[PDB]
């Protein structure tokens, strides 16, 4: 493919994984 | 961007518009020869169906109706009575 459907770039892929820290973040909270 | 991506101006989560976006930048991308009409007609596009989305947030977000009829009757005074009582107080110290 290309990769232009992305923009711009990489901290667009780091913007995804701080919501994968939310799910571990938000539900470690719940049990405390 | 700061405060909710659920309340977005163009619409990207509830809304699929920003895919047409990404297409809109395909096509426009590696355009040889480079003009003004096809920069130009776009950015229609990406505004007016896009305005009218953030105009049925704050309708339901923060009264439009409401607020600036509101303000006016406190600024362009449509409320006589209940402010000649202010008059009354405000005339025995404002010398």
Redesign the interface.
């Known amino acids: 493919s290309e990769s232009v459907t992305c923009q711009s770039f990489e901290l667009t892929l780091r913007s995804c994984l701080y919501p994968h820290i939310g799910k571990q973040y938000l539900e470690c909270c719940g049990n405390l | 961007e700061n405060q909710n991506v659920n309340m977005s101006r163009t619409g990207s989560i509830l809304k699929n518009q920003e895919?047409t976006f990404?297409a809109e930048?395909?096509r426009l991308?590696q355009q040889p020869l480079f003009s003004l009409v096809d920069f130009e007609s776009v950015l229609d596009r990406i505004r007016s169906t896009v305005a009218e989305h953030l105009w049925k947030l704050m309708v339901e977000e923060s009264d439009l109706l409401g607020q600036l009829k509101i303000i006016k009757d406190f600024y362009l005074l449509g409320r006589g009575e209940l402010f000649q009582a202010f008059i009354d107080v405000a005339q025995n110290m404002l010398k």
């Open positions: 895919d990404a930048l395909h991308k």
